[PDB]
């Protein structure tokens, strides 16, 4: 654990990127987290919402 | 814009509607700005046969 100061920085950036990428799996109230499924299933009046 | 439709189809003259008059006769856009004025014309458009 001697080089913890540098490893902590690497870990914080890795966690930040992993968190950002994992947010793409969230629905945020939408019917699906996948944009392609929404566009494949819905027409613009509902798809835009 | 002016036309004659059936009374049950009066509801179709709106943004975001589906059916036969909307999908095939008089489609309105979803960002439509305007007024849909309609009135019963049985005394003008009906005939016995």
Curated annotation (Swiss-Prot), chain A:
Subunit of the fusion protein that is processed upon entry into the host cell. Mediates fusion of the virion and cellular membranes by functioning as a class I viral fusion protein. Contains a viral fusion peptide that is unmasked after S2 cleavage. This cleavage can occur at the cell membrane by host TMPRSS2 or during endocytosis by host CSTL. In either case, this triggers an extensive and irreversible conformational change that leads to fusion of the viral envelope with the cellular cytoplasmic membrane, releasing viral genomic RNA into the host cell cytoplasm. This is Spike protein S2'. The gene is S. Residues 7-49 form a coiled coil. Changing residue 39 to F: In strain: Omicron/BA.1.
């Amino acid at each position: 654990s001697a080089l913890g100061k540098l490893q902590d920085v690497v870990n914080q950036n890795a966690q930040a990127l992993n968190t950002l990428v994992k947010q793409l799996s969230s629905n945020f109230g939408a019917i699906s987290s996948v944009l392609n499924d929404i566009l494949s299933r819905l027409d613009p009046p509902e798809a835009e919402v | 814009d002016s036309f004659v439709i059936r009374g049950d189809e009066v509801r179709q003259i709106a943004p975001g509607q589906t059916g036969k008059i909307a999908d095939y006769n008089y489609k309105l856009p979803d960002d439509f700005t305007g007024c849909v004025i309609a009135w019963n014309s049985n005394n003008l458009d009906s005939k016995v046969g």
